Amino acid sequence: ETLNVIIPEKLDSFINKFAEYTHEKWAFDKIQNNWSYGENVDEELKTHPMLRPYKTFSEKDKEIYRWPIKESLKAMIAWEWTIEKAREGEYNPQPPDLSGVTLSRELQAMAEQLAENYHNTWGRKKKQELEALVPYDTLTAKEKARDREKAQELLKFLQMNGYAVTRIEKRFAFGFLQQLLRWMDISQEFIAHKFFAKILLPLINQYFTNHCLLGSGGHASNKEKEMITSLLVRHRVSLFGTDAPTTLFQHIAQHQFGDDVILDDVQLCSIYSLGTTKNTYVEKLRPAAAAMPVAFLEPQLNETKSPRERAILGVIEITLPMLCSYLPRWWPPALPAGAPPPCTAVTSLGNILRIIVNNLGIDEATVFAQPIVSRARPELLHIPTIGRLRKRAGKVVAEEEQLRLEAKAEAERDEFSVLCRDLYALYPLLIRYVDNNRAHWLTEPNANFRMVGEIFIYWSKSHNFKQNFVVQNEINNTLKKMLPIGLNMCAPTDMLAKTRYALKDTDELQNNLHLQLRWQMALYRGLEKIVRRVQEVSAVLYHLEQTELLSKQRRRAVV
Amino acid sequence: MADQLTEEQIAEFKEAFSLFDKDGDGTITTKALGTVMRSLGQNPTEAELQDMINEVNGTIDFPAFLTMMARKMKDTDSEEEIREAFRVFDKDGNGYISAAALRHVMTNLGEKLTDEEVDEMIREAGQVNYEAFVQMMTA
Amino acid sequence: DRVRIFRAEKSYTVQSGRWYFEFEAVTTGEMRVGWARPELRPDVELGADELAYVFNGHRGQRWHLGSEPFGRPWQSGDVVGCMIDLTENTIIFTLNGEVLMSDSGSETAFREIEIGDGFLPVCSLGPGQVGHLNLGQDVSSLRFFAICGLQEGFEPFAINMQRPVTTWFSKSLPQFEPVPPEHPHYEVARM
Amino acid sequence: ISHTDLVIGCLVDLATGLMTFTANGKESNTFFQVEPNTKLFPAVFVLPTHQNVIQFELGKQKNIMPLSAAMFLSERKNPAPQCPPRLEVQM
Numbered sequence: 001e002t003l004n005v006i007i008p009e010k011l012d013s014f015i016n017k018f019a020e021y022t023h024e025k026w027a028f029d030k031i032q033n034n035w036s037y038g039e040n041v042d043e044e045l046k047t048h049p050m051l052r053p054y055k056t057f058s059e060k061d062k063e064i065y066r067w068p069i070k071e072s073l074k075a076m077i078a079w080e081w082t083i084e085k086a087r088e089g090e091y092n093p094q095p096p097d098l099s100g101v102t103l104s105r106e107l108q109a110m111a112e113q114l115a116e117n118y119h120n121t122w123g124r125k126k127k128q129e130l131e132a133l134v135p136y137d138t139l140t141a142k143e144k145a146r147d148r149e150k151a152q153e154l155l156k157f158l159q160m161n162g163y164a165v166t167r168i169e170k171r172f173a174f175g176f177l178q179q180l181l182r183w184m185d186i187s188q189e190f191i192a193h194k195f196f197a198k199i200l201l202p203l204i205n206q207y208f209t210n211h212c213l214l215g216s217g218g219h220a221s222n223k224e225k226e227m228i229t230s231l232l233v234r235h236r237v238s239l240f241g242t243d244a245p246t247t248l249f250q251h252i253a254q255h256q257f258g259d260d261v262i263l264d265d266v267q268l269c270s271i272y273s274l275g276t277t278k279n280t281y282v283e284k285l286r287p288a289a290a291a292m293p294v295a296f297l298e299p300q301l302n303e304t305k306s307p308r309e310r311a312i313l314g315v316i317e318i319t320l321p322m323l324c325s326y327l328p329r330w331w332p333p334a335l336p337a338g339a340p341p342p343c344t345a346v347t348s349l350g351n352i353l354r355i356i357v358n359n360l361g362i363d364e365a366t367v368f369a370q371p372i373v374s375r376a377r378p379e380l381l382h383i384p385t386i387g388r389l390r391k392r393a394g395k396v397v398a399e400e401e402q403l404r405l406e407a408k409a410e411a412e413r414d415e416f417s418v419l420c421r422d423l424y425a426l427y428p429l430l431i432r433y434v435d436n437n438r439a440h441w442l443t444e445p446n447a448n449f450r451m452v453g454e455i456f457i458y459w460s461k462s463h464n465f466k467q468n469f470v471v472q473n474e475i476n477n478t479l480k481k482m483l484p485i486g487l488n489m490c491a492p493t494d495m496l497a498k499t500r501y502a503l504k505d506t507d508e509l510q511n512n513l514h515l516q517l518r519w520q521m522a523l524y525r526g527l528e529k530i531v532r533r534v535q536e537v538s539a540v541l542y543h544l545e546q547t548e549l550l551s552k553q554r555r556r557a558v559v
Numbered sequence: 560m561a562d563q564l565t566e567e568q569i570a571e572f573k574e575a576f577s578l579f580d581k582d583g584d585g586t587i588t589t590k591a592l593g594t595v596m597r598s599l600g601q602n603p604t605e606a607e608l609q610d611m612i613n614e615v616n617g618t619i620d621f622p623a624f625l626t627m628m629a630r631k632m633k634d635t636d637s638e639e640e641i642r643e644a645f646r647v648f649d650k651d652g653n654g655y656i657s658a659a660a661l662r663h664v665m666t667n668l669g670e671k672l673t674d675e676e677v678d679e680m681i682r683e684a685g686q687v688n689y690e691a692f693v694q695m696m697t698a
Numbered sequence: 699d700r701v702r703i704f705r706a707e708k709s710y711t712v713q714s715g716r717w718y719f720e721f722e723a724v725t726t727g728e729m730r731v732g733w734a735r736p737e738l739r740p741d742v743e744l745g746a747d748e749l750a751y752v753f754n755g756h757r758g759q760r761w762h763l764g765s766e767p768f769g770r771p772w773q774s775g776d777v778v779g780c781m782i783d784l785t786e787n788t789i790i791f792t793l794n795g796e797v798l799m800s801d802s803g804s805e806t807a808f809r810e811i812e813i814g815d816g817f818l819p820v821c822s823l824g825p826g827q828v829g830h831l832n833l834g835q836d837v838s839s840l841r842f843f844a845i846c847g848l849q850e851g852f853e854p855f856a857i858n859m860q861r862p863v864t865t866w867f868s869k870s871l872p873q874f875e876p877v878p879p880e881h882p883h884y885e886v887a888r889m
Numbered sequence: 890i891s892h893t894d895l896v897i898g899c900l901v902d903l904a905t906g907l908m909t910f911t912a913n914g915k916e917s918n919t920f921f922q923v924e925p926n927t928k929l930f931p932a933v934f935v936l937p938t939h940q941n942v943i944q945f946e947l948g949k950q951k952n953i954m955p956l957s958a959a960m961f962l963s964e965r966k967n968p969a970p971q972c973p974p975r976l977e978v979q980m
Contacts, residue, residue: 492849
């Protein structure tokens with residue numbers, strides 16, 4: 001403190017140099033606005049009778065300029081534990097050339113602690129003047145504009161004239177490391193059996209800052225104690241940290257932990273199995289104990305069957321599966337192995353799509369088709385449409401016969417059984433026509449020859465979708481005709497005047513009412529009659545059709 | 560009014576008021592009004608006692624005394640009946656409401672509504688939950 | 699040291715119908731290609747104010763009254779179509795015969811626009827950049843119109859003009875002109 | 890800053906090619922001289938630092954008629970100052 005300070009003999013040359021340099025430029029910086037000289041220091045003439053240095057004037061120009069600076073030199077000798085001077089300094093006089101001594105490694109706070117010793121000591125005295133608050137960092141952008149004229153003035157008793165008392169949230173990540181340091185004890189202080197709430201207000205806070213995506217692995221350093229102590233609390237936060245793209249030694253041990261129960265797995269386990277779920281998410285997290293997962297190839301080959309294959313998603317026996325799928329196409333439980341064949345599918349090549357053609361034969365009379373179609377069209381690129389023209393269209397023809405059988409049953413209790421029987425194709429077609437849709441996004445440029453009823457299969461289904469799919473809309477746990485809209489473009493590749501008149505009898509079978517300037521449009525058109533338009537007319541007829549007070553106290557009474 | 564209180568609490572409020580009646584003339588002082596409330600169980604702050612007597616010499620009798628806690632019992636239940644409302648509405652008692660039954664359960668609710676107003680009060684709230692239905696019903 | 703803009707004459711504006719044109723950029727870089735109102739000041743850059751609906755040239759975003767990221771960026775030597783349907787007031791962008799989607803998975807690029815005095819095609823060329831502008835006066839020079847646009851009942855812009863369309867640009871030579879009386883900042887007083 | 894109102898003037902002679910200035914009557918050292926078949930536009934250039942900036946004050950001294958006599962052929966023998974509504978300020 002400056003009041004009970006140690007006033008030495010070296011607080012005399014630095015106090016008079018922190019006061020004169022604070023009072024030398026008082027006479028020159030105001031002369032541009034007519035700093036006059038008269039009988040008073042007034043503002044009418046803008047005069048400055050106090051325009052004098054505090055060292056060269058009389059004793060009266062120093063009680064509020066040098067005595068506040070000697071007490072500041074009693075504060076600059078009490079701000080830090082370094083009270084010494086080892087150099088000299090640096091009308092209309094000017095201050096010392098001290099604009100190069102900026103905020104250094106030690107002169108940053110020492111030129112600001114003398115400001116605080118001039119502010120907070122006088123502000124506590126201002127609080128002793130109010131009854132009988134410009135803070136340091138709580139001064140805002142407008143308050144620091146009024147807090148910088150004296151801080152630079154207090155920067156002359158810290159780095160000038162040798163009066164030298166000289167001496168983002170990775171710390172939160174260090175606190176997270178301290179949390180991990182706390183986790184070394186907190187996962188041991190209940191093993192052999194106020195701060196838990198400190199761990200409570202953290203699991204959601206960890207999830208937050210990661211969504212705002214030097215010391216990158218410092219957070220990954222914290223990603224350590226969780227996986228060991230476990231195998232629902234911060235497990236979601238771990239999954240939240242999983243997407244946030246040395247410790248991989250525990251992976252083979254976890255694989256050994258999976259192998260710890262894999263002996264009698266043919267016929268706890270909660271912490272074990274849940275570990276691999278977040279690991280699998282962490283596996284394809286860097287998808288912008290090396291071959292230790294060879295146990296995984298024999299894991300599903302041993303005996304949550306496909307759920308094991310669900311974790312599998314991170315070579316010459318493919319030809320050995322080519323007949324095995326074909327024998328299954330001639331025919332079960334190799335779909336998880338096919339998922340294990342899908343786990344390393346396209347690494348970079350023609351009959352890879354024949355696997356789906358093999359899968360279609362099983363699905364020609366057919367289970368969990370959700371994951372079976374999920375990772376399906378990840379490389380649907382490679383033609384095969386000629387077999388596909390006979391494939392799904394017959395499946396559509398099976399489906400066209402299916403609903404017609406349903407409608408014939410609906411052409412006359414017992415109808416509730418048929419209202420649940422229509423969910424068979426509903427799970428099927430939603431699993432079917434999806435990978436086929438991405439195949440259509442390849443032939444669109446190409447077919448611009450045998451899609452003449454391939455479009456009509458959708459529209460017949462759409463007319464069937466036109467109650468009749470209310471037990472299909474509930475199978476969500478709209479792709480019902482969206483692909484038909486995508487396939488509607490090539491269906492317009494067939495002078496439609498009667499088609500414009502066709503949309504009337506199809507909203508009144510129009511096989512009787514339809515029985516009986518434009519050169520630029522017909523330019524490229526030139527560059528088997530009646531039903532070559534009625535089919536397309538019925539499509540848009542449904543497609544456009546697809547596009548097609550209470551008083552106060554009574555409401556206070558019915559409540 | 561004085562209909563929201565049923566009879567047995569006032570059968571308890573009488574002798575609770577009468578025991579601390581200072582003279583048997585049915586009156587009390589202003590300070591004992593909090594002391595009886597400690598025996599009731601409802602313990603409000605000191606700030607919740609001036610506005611009682613600001614609403615009404617310092618002489619309080621059983622006429623004026625009923626009007627205090629009648630103002631202090633309706634507010635503790637008028638914002639609470641929206642919780643006890645939904646208990647027979649849904650099936651299991653959770654919050655999801657099938658809109659199929661609500662098109663015809665409101666035509667025999669006893670308030671004798673029609674089919675017109677109940678269609679005026681369903682789409683402004685397939686399935687609407689419990690808390691958006693009352694938000695347009697309690698107004 | 700600025701950016702040029704290009705548009706057709708005010709007489710060629712449309713009020714109805716269903717119109718389309720193409721644009722083949724030579725080099726990738728800084729372009730702006732879209733549609734615009736007639737009363738367009740040349741001071742501001744394209745798409746900043748409420749007077750134009752335009753696409754990016756560099757990073758793949760739509761530009762009207764600000765920005766919003768939209769679609770795949772530019773390879774060098776590609777065709778960016780532009781579409782508009784006055785029957786429902788929608789703006790549709792294509793790219794090499796492929797419709798550009800949004801971040802929210804929406805098909806349109808703009809929606810429920812007021813017609814007003816109608817629109818007319820527009821373009822912009824940055825410093826150093828180059829790209830020519832087919833517009834539809836030759837039906838044979840339409841690359842991706844048969845792929846997308848012809849089957850939807852769209853029309854090319856210069857479908858039947860016996861001569862190509864006039865164009866206007868913004869030149870940089872500063873001229874003199876009287877002060878507008880509805881100016882923001884300054885005024886004059888002839889007392 | 891200032892506390893008064895600085896007035897600058899201008900003088901051109903149409904039959905000699907003389908082109909000179911004033912500054913509150915105290916003339917300046919510089920002047921200009923031009924070829925005879927030249928059109929001149931009276932111009933200013935300014936950066937504003939105040940709510941009011943500048944006023945084009947057209948008037949006359951005791952031996953020189955204003956600019957109204959130069960623009961309009963019907964006003965050659967009229968020494969009065971006039972601001973007709975074709976005279977505007979460009980930008």
